[PDB]
């Protein structure tokens, strides 16, 4: 890790093994649920400002051999040339994301910039390695459970988009797409009412969740329903 | 109708009733399939350069009383103020889309500009009146038939988006949304292969149609299949 | 451990015993799987910049008496003279990799260089001690499992090369050799297709893995197969 010392100079210290093992033990494996470790590592990359060697310990400790490999190749595939486009030119790929220890000096602006880029590419690698073979059926299979809140259902639906499509459900250009899945795959009472909303085209994903919550939050308690039935007094 | 005369001056002539009645008789009613008459009228608005009175004959002849009313209110709802935003200010609405004969003189740039705008708003009115209550189930219900070509299926899917959602399936921002429905609702053999395409995220709607056609075009003729079976020679 | 202090001077602190014991407890023994501890120690040698005494604690804590001995003799066997060749000259061997505490002063370039070399030789020792009696049958016995991904299979195949041959499967000169084992020992459907690839000679190990993944990723789901069978409608 690196931190700005009291003297205005970066200061280095190695990761405590307790932190590394705690991070490992409190999360699923990367393969089981890539989002978990990816989010943890994204955070650490910022708070701990790891050097290249530190990143090797992170990866080496939190990922299996096969996972790390996937991530590293994905990171190298994320390198861009000075024209902002992908590049497979060995020297450019090696310079951005070296597989062997680089001579980066954190006391230099040059070293720092490489470290920044390296960390950014590492994150990209994990994000992309966390992707699986596109399978739209998995997205269509996310249906709101009878007790499931609209916001909880939406999070599961977004997770399926992330895992099983190339589309980022948080992109502004995907909003109507996620919105349509949300409406279609909500519980039937909710979906029928969302479909009938006035100025439906104008509803954001957040609007739709709030409208679904109004219906859900109108759940009509089991006790209440039973009481009504009892007071039914209509016989056959 | 108006046309540029041989002397560089606009020339007026009334619609032949044969054209009006032919247009009516060769198309479904607006209610049955709004796209038909809307496209015909959009074309005529250009080729025939109708005046306000001509537009009344068009509407009066091709639409029922109830359809025309819907269209006219939809057209007035499409009027924009000078700030490009909707306006319900009577004077602005009346000036753009008058319900009673205006004093527009086609020999004046002023008259011509009003005519242009009027025609544009009329078209907008028809496009919007042609919309129905949002019903996502209708879009999910468009499934490729066993003999249906991928391009024919895509056109039916787009028609459902137009009729039963507020989303324009031709908008660039809707492409991934339409693409996902196209993949999910294609015939199962096709959908499974489209889902497995390399660099799926990179495929346009046109790309997906071409890939689906390759599979469809690999239909494996009934005769061929039967022949194979005959030459099976595998008994039980 | 050593680290560059805020004053530009190396600073020493002893290993926390919690780190040493955590490293031990979270890994297999060296004998069980040498790669585990070797990779951990390679990392620590960099991040913790251990002195000669620190290295004795590392080895003493993570290895058994018999393992440490193997490693130390292997490290001394890795010493090179100034002509880049092996040397068994006592003074040269002792100077590079001393068995008794040396007078290396980390505040001197002389001391630092010896420390660098010592750590490099220690790593070499572990890498070589981790080797076992050459046994090609073990490499031929690595066969892809029916559920095993091509990348997971390749990692197991490389592990067998490391453990049971003198060849480094990551060497550029071994690529065709590993490639041929990969093709021959892949699952039969995959191997038959890899063998038929156009311009096979041009395929890297990475290319072959990607081609095998396309076949594997075409696994034809059990459910799918069953469905097909049901819809078979061919009786006997």
Residue numbers in the entry:
A (entry chain B), B (entry chain A), C (entry chain C): 1 to 236
Task: Please share text taken word for word from the publication where this structure appeared.
Immature retroviruses are built by the Gag polyprotein; Gag is then cut into domains, and the resulting CA capsid proteins form the mature capsid, which can mediate infection of a new cell. Murine leukemia virus (MLV), the prototypic member of the γ-retroviruses, is commonly used in comparative studies and as a basis for retroviral vector design. The CA domain and immediate downstream residues mediate protein interactions in the immature shell, and, following proteolytic cleavage, CA forms the mature viral capsid. In this study, we have determined the structure of the truncated MLV CA-CTD by X-ray crystallography and have resolved the architecture and CA lattice structures of immature and mature MLV particles by cryo-ET and subtomogram averaging.
Purified mature, infectious MLV particles from the culture medium of transfected HEK293T cells were inactivated and subjected to cryo-ET, and 134 mature viruses were identified in 65 tomograms. We applied subtomogram averaging to obtain a density map of the CA hexamer in the core of the mature virions at 7.2-Å resolution. As previously described for HIV-1, the mature MLV CA lattice is thinner than the immature Gag shell, consisting of a single layer including CA-NTD and CA-CTD. The hexamer–hexamer spacing in the middle of the mature CA layer was 10.0 ± 0.4 nm, consistent with previous measurements from HIV-1 (28), and larger than that in the immature virus. The CA-CTD interacts at the twofold axes via helix 9 (black arrow), as seen in other retroviruses, but also via interactions between K201 in helix 310b and D171 in the loop between helices 8 and 9 (black arrowhead). As for HIV-1, in mature MLV, there is a CA-CTD–CA-NTD interface. This involves helix 4 and helix 8 (asterisk). The observed density extends beyond the C terminus of the truncated protein used for crystallography in a short rod-shaped density toward the center of the core (red arrowhead). This density would accommodate an α-helix corresponding approximately to residues P222–R230 of the CAH. Three of these short helices cluster around the threefold symmetry axis, bringing their C-terminal ends toward one another (red arrowhead, triangle).
